[PDB]
Coordinates of C-alpha atoms in Angstrom, one line a residue:
Chain A
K1 CA -8.1 13.8 26.8
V2 CA -11.5 12.8 25.7
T3 CA -13.9 13.3 28.2
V4 CA -17.8 13.8 28.6
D5 CA -17.9 17.1 27.1
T6 CA -15.9 15.6 24.7
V7 CA -17.9 15.7 20.8
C8 CA -16.4 12.6 18.7
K9 CA -16.4 13.9 14.8
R10 CA -18.1 10.8 12.9
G11 CA -17.9 9.1 16.0
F12 CA -19.7 7.8 19.7
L13 CA -19.1 8.0 23.1
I14 CA -18.8 5.1 24.8
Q15 CA -16.9 4.2 28.1
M16 CA -15.2 2.2 29.9
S17 CA -14.8 0.9 33.7
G18 CA -11.6 3.9 33.5
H19 CA -11.7 6.1 30.8
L20 CA -14.1 7.1 27.7
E21 CA -12.7 7.1 24.2
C22 CA -14.9 7.3 20.5
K23 CA -16.2 4.7 18.8
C24 CA -16.4 5.4 14.3
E25 CA -19.2 5.1 13.0
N26 CA -19.3 2.7 9.9
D27 CA -15.9 1.8 8.3
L28 CA -14.2 5.2 9.4
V29 CA -10.1 4.8 11.1
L30 CA -9.1 7.2 14.1
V31 CA -7.1 10.1 12.6
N32 CA -7.0 11.6 16.6
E33 CA -8.7 11.1 20.0
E34 CA -11.8 12.5 18.3
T35 CA -12.5 12.6 14.4
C36 CA -12.9 9.6 11.7
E37 CA -12.2 9.7 8.7
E38 CA -12.3 7.3 5.6
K39 CA -9.0 4.6 5.5
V40 CA -6.9 4.6 1.9
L41 CA -6.7 0.9 0.7
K42 CA -3.3 1.8 -1.0
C43 CA -0.3 4.0 -0.4
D44 CA 0.9 5.9 -3.2
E45 CA 1.9 9.7 -4.2
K46 CA -1.2 10.8 -4.1
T47 CA -2.2 8.4 -0.9
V48 CA 0.8 10.0 1.1
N49 CA 0.0 11.5 4.8
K50 CA -3.4 10.0 3.9
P51 CA -4.8 8.3 6.9
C52 CA -4.7 4.2 7.0
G53 CA -5.9 2.5 9.9
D54 CA -6.7 3.8 13.4
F55 CA -3.3 6.0 14.2
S56 CA -1.5 5.4 11.2
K57 CA -1.3 7.3 8.0
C58 CA 0.7 6.8 4.6
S59 CA 8.8 3.8 -0.5
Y60 CA 5.2 3.9 1.2
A61 CA 3.7 2.1 4.2
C62 CA 1.4 2.7 6.7
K63 CA 3.1 3.2 9.9
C64 CA 2.0 3.9 13.2
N65 CA 2.0 8.0 14.7
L66 CA 4.9 8.6 17.4
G67 CA 3.5 6.4 20.2
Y68 CA 2.2 4.0 18.8
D69 CA 3.2 0.2 17.9
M70 CA 2.2 -1.9 15.3
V71 CA 1.3 -5.2 17.8
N72 CA -1.1 -7.8 16.0
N73 CA -1.8 -5.6 13.1
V74 CA -3.3 -3.1 15.4
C75 CA -1.8 0.4 16.4
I76 CA -1.8 0.4 20.9
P77 CA 0.4 2.8 22.6
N78 CA 3.9 2.5 23.1
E79 CA 3.6 1.7 27.0
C80 CA 0.7 -0.8 26.0
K81 CA 3.1 -3.4 24.1
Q82 CA 2.7 -6.2 26.7
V83 CA 0.2 -5.6 28.2
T84 CA -3.1 -7.9 28.4
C85 CA -5.9 -6.7 30.3
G86 CA -8.4 -10.0 29.6
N87 CA -11.5 -8.0 30.1
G88 CA -10.9 -5.0 28.6
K89 CA -8.5 -2.8 26.9
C90 CA -5.2 -1.4 27.9
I91 CA -4.8 2.7 28.2
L92 CA -2.4 5.6 29.5
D93 CA -2.7 6.2 33.2
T94 CA -4.1 9.8 32.4
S95 CA -2.6 10.3 36.4
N96 CA 0.4 8.8 35.4
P97 CA 3.2 11.7 34.2
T98 CA 2.1 4.1 32.5
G99 CA -0.2 0.9 30.6
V100 CA -2.9 0.2 32.5
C101 CA -5.9 -1.9 32.3
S102 CA -9.4 0.1 31.7
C103 CA -11.6 -2.7 32.0
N104 CA -15.7 -3.8 30.4
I105 CA -18.6 -2.7 32.4
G106 CA -19.6 -4.7 34.7
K107 CA -15.8 -5.5 36.0
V108 CA -12.8 -3.4 37.5
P109 CA -9.3 -3.6 37.9
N110 CA -8.5 -6.2 40.7
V111 CA -6.0 -4.7 42.9
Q112 CA -5.2 -8.6 44.8
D113 CA -4.9 -9.9 41.0
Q114 CA -2.5 -6.6 39.8
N115 CA -5.2 -4.6 38.9
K116 CA -6.3 -6.9 36.1
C117 CA -9.9 -7.0 35.2
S118 CA -11.4 -9.4 37.5
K119 CA -12.7 -7.7 40.4
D120 CA -16.9 -7.3 40.3
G121 CA -17.3 -3.8 40.4
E122 CA -19.6 -0.8 39.2
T123 CA -19.3 2.0 36.8
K124 CA -21.8 5.5 36.8
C125 CA -22.3 6.0 33.6
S126 CA -20.6 10.0 33.0
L127 CA -22.1 10.2 29.1
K128 CA -24.2 13.3 28.4
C129 CA -26.5 11.6 25.6
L130 CA -27.5 15.4 24.2
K131 CA -30.6 13.5 21.8
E132 CA -33.4 13.3 22.4
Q133 CA -35.6 10.5 23.3
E134 CA -32.6 8.6 24.7
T135 CA -30.6 7.8 27.6
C136 CA -27.2 6.1 28.4
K137 CA -27.2 2.1 28.1
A138 CA -25.2 -0.7 28.4
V139 CA -24.3 -3.3 25.7
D140 CA -21.7 -5.5 24.8
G141 CA -19.6 -4.7 28.3
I142 CA -19.7 -0.5 27.8
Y143 CA -21.4 2.1 28.0
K144 CA -23.1 4.3 25.3
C145 CA -25.5 6.5 24.4
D146 CA -28.9 4.6 22.5
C147 CA -32.6 4.9 22.1
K148 CA -35.3 4.3 25.3
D149 CA -36.8 1.6 26.3
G150 CA -39.1 3.6 24.0
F151 CA -37.5 3.9 20.5
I152 CA -35.2 3.1 17.8
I153 CA -33.7 3.7 15.4
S154 CA -32.0 7.9 11.3
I155 CA -33.2 9.6 15.1
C156 CA -34.5 7.3 17.9
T157 CA -38.4 6.9 17.6
Chain B
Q1 CA -19.8 -16.5 37.1
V2 CA -22.5 -15.6 34.0
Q3 CA -23.5 -18.9 34.4
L4 CA -25.6 -20.3 31.8
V5 CA -28.7 -23.5 33.2
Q6 CA -30.7 -24.8 30.8
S7 CA -33.9 -27.3 30.7
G8 CA -34.2 -31.0 30.3
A9 CA -34.1 -33.3 27.9
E10 CA -37.2 -32.9 26.0
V11 CA -38.8 -36.1 23.6
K12 CA -41.5 -34.7 20.5
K13 CA -42.7 -36.4 17.4
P14 CA -42.0 -35.5 14.3
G15 CA -43.7 -32.6 13.2
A16 CA -44.5 -30.8 16.2
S17 CA -42.7 -28.2 18.0
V18 CA -39.8 -27.9 21.1
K19 CA -39.2 -24.7 23.4
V20 CA -35.8 -24.6 25.1
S21 CA -34.8 -22.0 28.3
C22 CA -31.6 -21.4 29.4
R23 CA -31.8 -19.5 32.7
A24 CA -28.7 -17.0 32.6
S25 CA -27.3 -15.7 35.8
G26 CA -24.0 -13.7 37.1
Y27 CA -24.2 -11.0 35.2
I28 CA -26.1 -8.4 33.5
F29 CA -29.5 -9.8 31.5
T30 CA -30.3 -7.0 29.1
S31 CA -26.7 -5.7 28.4
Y32 CA -25.8 -9.0 26.2
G33 CA -27.3 -11.7 23.3
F34 CA -27.7 -15.3 23.2
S35 CA -26.5 -17.8 20.2
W36 CA -28.1 -21.6 20.2
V37 CA -25.4 -23.9 19.0
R38 CA -27.0 -27.7 18.0
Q39 CA -24.7 -31.0 17.7
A40 CA -25.7 -33.9 15.9
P41 CA -24.7 -37.4 17.7
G42 CA -20.7 -38.1 17.0
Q43 CA -21.2 -34.6 14.6
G44 CA -19.7 -31.2 14.8
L45 CA -21.5 -28.1 15.9
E46 CA -23.5 -26.5 13.8
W47 CA -24.8 -22.3 14.7
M48 CA -28.2 -22.5 14.3
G49 CA -28.9 -18.2 15.4
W50 CA -28.8 -15.0 17.3
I51 CA -31.0 -13.2 19.7
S52 CA -30.4 -10.1 21.2
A53 CA -31.3 -9.5 25.2
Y54 CA -30.6 -5.9 24.5
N55 CA -32.3 -5.0 21.3
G56 CA -34.5 -7.4 19.9
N57 CA -32.1 -8.9 16.9
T58 CA -33.4 -11.6 16.0
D59 CA -31.3 -13.5 13.7
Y60 CA -31.1 -17.0 12.1
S61 CA -29.5 -19.9 9.7
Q62 CA -30.4 -19.8 6.2
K63 CA -30.7 -23.3 5.9
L64 CA -32.8 -23.2 8.6
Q65 CA -34.7 -20.0 8.4
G66 CA -38.1 -21.2 8.5
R67 CA -38.2 -23.1 11.6
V68 CA -36.9 -21.5 14.2
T69 CA -37.8 -19.4 16.8
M70 CA -35.9 -17.4 19.3
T71 CA -37.2 -14.5 21.9
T72 CA -35.7 -13.2 25.6
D73 CA -37.8 -12.8 28.6
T74 CA -36.5 -9.7 30.6
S75 CA -38.5 -10.6 33.4
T76 CA -36.9 -13.5 34.1
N77 CA -33.8 -14.2 33.1
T78 CA -34.3 -16.6 30.6
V79 CA -33.8 -17.0 26.6
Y80 CA -36.4 -19.4 25.1
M81 CA -35.7 -21.1 21.3
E82 CA -38.3 -22.6 19.6
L83 CA -38.0 -25.8 16.9
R84 CA -41.1 -26.0 14.6
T85 CA -41.2 -29.2 11.6
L86 CA -38.9 -31.4 14.0
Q87 CA -37.7 -33.6 11.4
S88 CA -36.1 -36.4 12.3
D89 CA -32.4 -35.5 11.6
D90 CA -33.3 -32.3 13.8
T91 CA -32.4 -35.3 16.8
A92 CA -29.4 -32.9 18.4
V93 CA -27.8 -31.8 21.7
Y94 CA -28.6 -28.4 21.9
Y95 CA -26.4 -25.7 23.7
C96 CA -26.9 -21.7 25.3
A97 CA -23.9 -19.8 24.7
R98 CA -23.7 -16.2 25.4
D99 CA -23.4 -13.9 22.2
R100 CA -22.6 -10.3 21.5
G101 CA -25.8 -7.5 22.1
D102 CA -25.4 -5.7 18.9
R103 CA -24.4 -7.2 15.6
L104 CA -23.3 -4.4 14.4
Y105 CA -20.8 -2.6 16.2
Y106 CA -17.6 -4.8 17.9
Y107 CA -16.5 -2.8 21.3
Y108 CA -13.8 -5.1 23.6
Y109 CA -16.8 -8.0 24.6
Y110 CA -15.6 -10.9 22.8
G111 CA -19.3 -13.5 22.3
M112 CA -19.4 -17.3 22.5
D113 CA -17.6 -17.1 26.1
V114 CA -20.0 -19.4 28.4
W115 CA -21.9 -22.3 27.5
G116 CA -24.9 -23.6 29.1
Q117 CA -25.1 -27.0 30.6
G118 CA -27.1 -28.9 26.9
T119 CA -29.7 -30.2 26.6
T120 CA -30.8 -33.0 24.4
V121 CA -33.7 -33.6 21.9
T122 CA -35.1 -36.1 20.7
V123 CA -37.8 -36.6 17.6
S124 CA -38.8 -40.1 16.8
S125 CA -42.9 -41.3 16.0
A126 CA -41.3 -44.7 18.6
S127 CA -43.6 -44.5 22.8
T128 CA -42.2 -45.9 25.9
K129 CA -41.0 -49.3 25.5
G130 CA -38.8 -51.9 27.5
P131 CA -35.6 -53.3 25.5
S132 CA -36.1 -57.2 24.6
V133 CA -32.2 -58.8 25.9
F134 CA -31.0 -61.7 23.7
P135 CA -27.9 -64.0 24.7
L136 CA -24.5 -63.9 22.4
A137 CA -23.6 -66.9 23.4
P138 CA -19.9 -67.9 22.7
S139 CA -18.7 -70.6 20.6
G140 CA -7.5 -69.4 24.9
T141 CA -9.8 -66.4 25.4
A142 CA -13.9 -66.3 24.1
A143 CA -16.0 -63.7 24.1
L144 CA -19.7 -63.6 25.1
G145 CA -22.5 -60.2 25.3
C146 CA -25.9 -60.1 25.2
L147 CA -28.1 -57.8 22.8
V148 CA -30.3 -54.5 23.9
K149 CA -32.9 -54.6 21.4
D150 CA -35.7 -52.8 20.3
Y151 CA -36.1 -49.4 23.4
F152 CA -36.9 -46.1 23.4
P153 CA -36.2 -44.2 24.7
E154 CA -32.5 -43.3 25.9
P155 CA -31.0 -44.3 27.9
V156 CA -30.0 -47.8 29.9
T157 CA -27.5 -49.2 32.5
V158 CA -25.8 -52.5 32.5
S159 CA -23.3 -54.7 34.4
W160 CA -22.1 -57.6 35.1
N161 CA -22.9 -59.6 37.6
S162 CA -24.3 -57.1 39.8
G163 CA -20.7 -54.8 38.9
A164 CA -18.7 -57.1 40.5
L165 CA -17.4 -58.3 36.6
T166 CA -16.1 -55.1 34.6
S167 CA -12.9 -55.9 33.6
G168 CA -13.1 -56.7 29.6
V169 CA -17.2 -54.7 29.5
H170 CA -17.5 -53.0 26.5
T171 CA -20.9 -51.0 26.5
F172 CA -21.8 -49.8 23.4
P173 CA -22.8 -46.4 22.3
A174 CA -26.7 -46.8 21.0
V175 CA -28.2 -46.9 17.0
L176 CA -31.3 -45.4 15.9
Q177 CA -32.4 -48.3 13.8
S178 CA -34.9 -47.8 10.6
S179 CA -38.1 -48.2 12.5
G180 CA -37.0 -45.3 15.2
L181 CA -36.3 -46.9 18.2
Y182 CA -32.6 -47.5 19.9
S183 CA -31.0 -50.5 20.1
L184 CA -27.0 -51.4 22.4
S185 CA -24.7 -54.0 22.8
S186 CA -22.7 -54.8 25.8
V187 CA -19.7 -58.1 25.4
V188 CA -17.6 -59.1 28.2
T189 CA -14.0 -61.3 27.6
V190 CA -13.2 -64.6 29.7
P191 CA -11.5 -67.3 29.7
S192 CA -12.8 -70.0 27.2
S193 CA -11.7 -73.3 28.5
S194 CA -11.4 -72.6 32.5
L195 CA -15.0 -70.4 32.5
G196 CA -17.5 -73.6 31.8
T197 CA -19.2 -72.8 34.8
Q198 CA -19.2 -69.2 36.0
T199 CA -22.9 -68.4 35.3
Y200 CA -23.3 -64.5 33.0
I201 CA -26.4 -62.0 33.7
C202 CA -27.0 -59.4 31.7
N203 CA -28.3 -57.7 34.3
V204 CA -29.9 -54.3 32.5
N205 CA -32.3 -51.6 34.3
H206 CA -33.6 -49.0 32.1
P207 CA -39.2 -49.0 33.1
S208 CA -37.6 -52.1 32.8
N209 CA -35.3 -54.5 35.0
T210 CA -34.1 -57.4 33.0
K211 CA -30.9 -60.2 33.8
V212 CA -30.5 -63.0 31.7
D213 CA -28.8 -65.9 32.2
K214 CA -25.9 -66.1 28.8
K215 CA -24.6 -70.0 29.2
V216 CA -23.2 -70.9 26.0
Chain C
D1 CA -19.9 -18.6 4.3
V2 CA -17.0 -18.9 5.7
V3 CA -15.9 -22.8 5.4
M4 CA -13.1 -23.9 8.5
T5 CA -11.5 -26.5 7.4
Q6 CA -9.4 -28.7 10.6
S7 CA -5.8 -30.9 10.2
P8 CA -6.1 -33.4 11.1
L9 CA -9.1 -35.4 11.7
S10 CA -8.0 -37.5 14.2
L11 CA -4.8 -36.5 16.1
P12 CA -2.6 -39.4 18.2
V13 CA -0.5 -37.9 21.0
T14 CA 1.2 -38.8 23.4
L15 CA 1.3 -37.7 26.9
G16 CA 4.0 -35.5 27.6
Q17 CA 4.7 -35.0 23.9
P18 CA 3.3 -31.1 22.5
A19 CA 1.0 -31.6 19.8
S20 CA -0.6 -29.1 17.2
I21 CA -3.7 -28.3 15.6
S22 CA -4.7 -26.8 12.3
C23 CA -7.5 -24.6 11.3
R24 CA -7.7 -22.8 7.4
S25 CA -10.5 -20.3 6.7
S26 CA -11.9 -19.9 3.0
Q27 CA -11.7 -16.3 3.5
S28 CA -9.5 -13.6 5.4
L29 CA -10.2 -13.6 8.9
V30 CA -8.9 -9.8 9.7
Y31 CA -11.8 -8.0 10.3
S32 CA -12.5 -4.6 9.7
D33 CA -10.8 -3.6 13.1
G34 CA -7.9 -5.0 12.4
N35 CA -8.6 -7.8 14.0
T36 CA -8.5 -11.8 13.3
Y37 CA -11.8 -12.6 15.7
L38 CA -10.8 -16.9 15.9
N39 CA -11.7 -18.5 19.5
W40 CA -10.4 -22.5 19.8
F41 CA -13.0 -24.1 21.9
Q42 CA -12.9 -27.9 23.3
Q43 CA -15.4 -30.0 24.1
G44 CA -14.5 -33.3 25.9
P45 CA -16.7 -36.0 26.5
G46 CA -20.7 -35.3 26.8
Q47 CA -19.3 -32.1 28.0
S48 CA -20.2 -28.7 26.6
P49 CA -17.9 -27.1 24.5
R50 CA -15.2 -24.7 26.4
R51 CA -13.9 -21.7 24.8
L52 CA -9.4 -21.8 25.7
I53 CA -8.8 -19.1 22.7
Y54 CA -10.6 -15.8 22.2
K55 CA -10.0 -13.5 19.6
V56 CA -5.8 -14.2 18.0
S57 CA -3.5 -15.5 20.6
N58 CA -5.3 -14.5 24.1
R59 CA -6.3 -18.0 26.3
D60 CA -9.4 -17.5 28.8
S61 CA -9.6 -17.3 32.2
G62 CA -9.0 -20.8 34.0
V63 CA -6.9 -22.4 30.7
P64 CA -3.5 -23.9 31.6
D65 CA -0.5 -22.4 30.6
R66 CA 0.5 -25.9 28.1
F67 CA -2.6 -23.8 25.3
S68 CA -1.4 -21.6 23.0
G69 CA -2.8 -20.4 20.0
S70 CA -0.9 -18.4 16.8
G71 CA -1.4 -17.6 13.0
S72 CA -3.0 -15.0 11.4
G73 CA -4.8 -14.4 7.8
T74 CA -6.2 -18.1 7.3
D75 CA -4.3 -20.0 8.6
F76 CA -3.5 -20.7 12.2
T77 CA -2.8 -22.9 15.1
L78 CA -3.5 -24.2 18.4
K79 CA -0.2 -25.6 20.3
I80 CA -0.3 -28.1 23.3
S81 CA 3.1 -27.8 24.7
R82 CA 2.4 -30.7 26.9
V83 CA -0.7 -33.3 26.7
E84 CA -2.2 -34.2 29.6
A85 CA -4.8 -36.6 30.4
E86 CA -7.5 -34.4 30.5
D87 CA -6.7 -32.6 26.7
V88 CA -8.6 -36.0 25.2
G89 CA -11.7 -34.9 23.4
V90 CA -12.5 -32.7 19.9
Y91 CA -11.4 -29.1 19.5
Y92 CA -13.0 -27.1 17.7
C93 CA -11.7 -23.6 15.5
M94 CA -14.6 -20.8 15.3
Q95 CA -14.5 -17.7 13.8
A96 CA -17.0 -14.4 14.5
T97 CA -15.1 -11.5 12.1
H98 CA -17.5 -12.6 8.6
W99 CA -21.0 -13.3 9.7
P100 CA -22.7 -15.6 10.1
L101 CA -20.8 -17.7 13.1
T102 CA -18.5 -21.1 11.1
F103 CA -17.3 -23.4 13.5
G104 CA -14.4 -25.8 11.8
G105 CA -14.5 -30.1 11.5
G106 CA -13.6 -30.8 14.4
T107 CA -10.4 -32.7 15.8
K108 CA -10.5 -35.3 17.8
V109 CA -7.7 -35.8 20.2
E110 CA -6.6 -39.4 20.6
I111 CA -3.5 -41.3 22.8
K112 CA -1.4 -43.3 19.9
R113 CA -0.2 -46.6 20.8
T114 CA 1.1 -49.4 19.3
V115 CA -1.3 -51.1 16.8
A116 CA -3.1 -54.0 18.0
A117 CA -5.7 -56.2 15.7
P118 CA -9.1 -57.0 16.3
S119 CA -10.2 -60.0 17.8
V120 CA -13.0 -60.8 15.2
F121 CA -16.0 -62.6 16.8
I122 CA -19.5 -63.6 15.5
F123 CA -23.0 -64.1 17.5
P124 CA -25.7 -65.6 15.5
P125 CA -29.6 -64.4 16.5
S126 CA -31.0 -66.3 19.5
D127 CA -33.8 -68.6 18.9
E128 CA -35.7 -66.0 21.6
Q129 CA -35.6 -63.4 18.5
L130 CA -36.5 -65.7 15.5
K131 CA -39.7 -65.8 17.3
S132 CA -40.6 -62.3 17.2
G133 CA -40.0 -62.4 13.3
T134 CA -36.6 -61.0 13.0
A135 CA -33.3 -62.2 13.5
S136 CA -30.4 -59.5 14.5
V137 CA -26.8 -60.6 13.4
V138 CA -23.7 -59.1 16.0
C139 CA -19.6 -59.0 14.8
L140 CA -17.8 -57.8 17.7
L141 CA -14.0 -56.0 16.7
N142 CA -12.4 -56.4 20.2
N143 CA -9.8 -54.2 21.1
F144 CA -7.6 -52.6 17.8
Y145 CA -5.9 -49.6 17.1
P146 CA -6.1 -47.8 15.4
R147 CA -9.9 -46.6 15.4
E148 CA -10.7 -46.9 11.2
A149 CA -11.4 -50.2 10.1
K150 CA -13.6 -51.5 7.4
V151 CA -16.1 -54.3 8.6
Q152 CA -18.9 -55.6 5.5
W153 CA -21.1 -58.4 5.6
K154 CA -22.2 -61.1 3.1
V155 CA -24.5 -63.4 2.6
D156 CA -24.1 -66.5 1.2
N157 CA -21.6 -64.5 -0.5
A158 CA -23.5 -61.5 -1.4
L159 CA -22.4 -58.3 -0.2
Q160 CA -25.1 -56.4 2.7
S161 CA -25.4 -53.0 2.5
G162 CA -28.2 -50.3 4.1
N163 CA -29.1 -53.3 6.7
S164 CA -26.0 -52.9 9.1
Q165 CA -25.7 -50.1 11.5
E166 CA -22.0 -50.2 13.4
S167 CA -21.1 -48.8 17.0
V168 CA -17.5 -47.6 18.2
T169 CA -16.8 -47.6 22.1
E170 CA -15.2 -44.4 22.5
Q171 CA -10.8 -44.9 24.1
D172 CA -10.2 -47.1 27.3
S173 CA -8.7 -45.3 29.5
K174 CA -7.1 -48.4 30.6
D175 CA -5.6 -50.1 27.5
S176 CA -6.4 -47.4 25.2
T177 CA -8.0 -49.6 22.2
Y178 CA -11.2 -49.3 20.6
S179 CA -13.6 -52.0 20.0
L180 CA -16.5 -51.9 17.2
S181 CA -20.3 -53.9 17.0
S182 CA -21.9 -54.0 13.6
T183 CA -25.2 -55.3 13.9
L184 CA -27.3 -56.9 10.9
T185 CA -30.9 -57.0 10.7
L186 CA -33.1 -59.1 8.5
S187 CA -36.5 -60.2 8.9
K188 CA -37.6 -64.1 9.4
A189 CA -37.9 -65.1 5.8
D190 CA -35.2 -63.5 4.2
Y191 CA -32.9 -64.9 7.5
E192 CA -34.8 -68.0 6.5
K193 CA -34.0 -67.8 3.3
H194 CA -30.0 -68.4 3.2
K195 CA -27.3 -70.5 4.9
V196 CA -23.8 -68.6 5.7
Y197 CA -23.6 -65.5 7.0
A198 CA -20.1 -64.3 7.0
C199 CA -18.5 -60.6 8.5
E200 CA -15.7 -59.3 6.9
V201 CA -12.6 -56.9 8.4
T202 CA -10.2 -54.4 7.2
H203 CA -7.7 -53.3 9.5
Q204 CA -4.3 -52.7 9.7
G205 CA -3.5 -55.1 12.6
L206 CA -4.9 -58.0 9.8
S207 CA -2.4 -58.3 6.8
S208 CA -5.6 -60.0 5.1
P209 CA -8.8 -59.5 5.8
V210 CA -10.7 -61.9 8.2
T211 CA -13.7 -63.8 7.5
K212 CA -16.3 -65.4 10.3
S213 CA -19.2 -67.3 9.4
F214 CA -21.2 -69.8 10.9
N215 CA -24.2 -72.0 9.5
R216 CA -28.3 -71.1 9.8
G217 CA -28.4 -74.4 11.6

């Protein structure tokens, strides 16, 4: 369960309308919900069980983990197979023992539109930007930690 | 509503510069970026560059790297575009488009989703001049019309018999002559031997109002 | 840079019939995250482009069900289940996987109808224009199909080049035909030095080229 206290290994936290998740840095892929590692291009005996993509590891083939399915060459949760969210992403409902839509910042699920990301709504940023000279900033429909109004880039300065 | 409103049409002389604005509304301006796309007459779309309203990251096309300058105003929601050394082939319709804020990472937003109304930019050394209207006299269906030559800038509006004649009327798209002036033609088809008494006037309107009899 | 190639350049369609536009990329469009990023745009006549399809097969808000995108890697297809009248225009495919963004050459959707031979008429310059030192001869091709047509000016059996501009009307909403205008501009002295001025027309509706000519006097 990715929370505001989660430290993304080789990644950084981003926030949407209904959840938080780890975004991998550079060309790394998710091996779990909070750890990013480099992906192998081929699957053989030396690279068996090695990560070949997000929630997928290396008759050799790249297969999604349990609960995930290959949809458009991407592993998504099984309950999100037939879910389209538009201005957002399908996630598993942590409050339901079901695929629901988490929307880009600025949009919220519209109860008048089958909870699709078609309603204008604000989302309070919950990120704890630990690094100095940084704060929570909004960009491309998500919240992430970035330099303040007087800093940029190794470390913000 | 994420609407984009662009500035009016501009006319510049060769070698001069032009500034085009695009006022964003309906969303958080500083959370996204912009890309500018122009479209030559009768041609396709051409990517000119991209600028981030989030981090100020500008990026121009290598083919047009030395004459493009992009800025954003956070106070008043507007993205500006300055084009220097306006060549003759720069004459095109310029479009505004919302793109991503950071070019390095990709999230669940996909740019170029909203486009502005477009702005027309014409680069020519010509001055404002009214058109010359010459009849195209014919010689069981006959065709006639009028030639609208040497008028700058565009456009003109042509009706036949004050709009009472519309069937078979064809007003052609203007052409840019080698002299830098525009030229246009309007034709109409009438019964040949059955219309020897009807009067047909060009009825052209621009700073110029002109209707010319086009008999045989 | 990625080269985007659309086919066909012009697509004649019948109202109510399916249609498909092809778009091919010079490199694979699968991004580092596994996504493809192939957008489809629609540009009506005299209007701004609007994005119909985003990412792979996803439709933007307000796009009718008849539009659909498919394909993978370097080959993609935009299908229209039942073409409607407002679907005429130019369709572009654009990639965002590789920087910078590049658009396709475009695909012009037109209304398909039966072949019509053009009506060729020639108009010598007026006496009013000759009094100013310039002579413009107009050749008219009226109500024809398809849009493609070849026109050549001949002055005393000499082919003209670089002195003849052309323009074509949009597809008429009434008869779905096209019309072409060609303007040959020459100086007064050059116009007075010749006698016969002819206009040659080549088109599918004509089994042989049609020539319309006039004498200077």
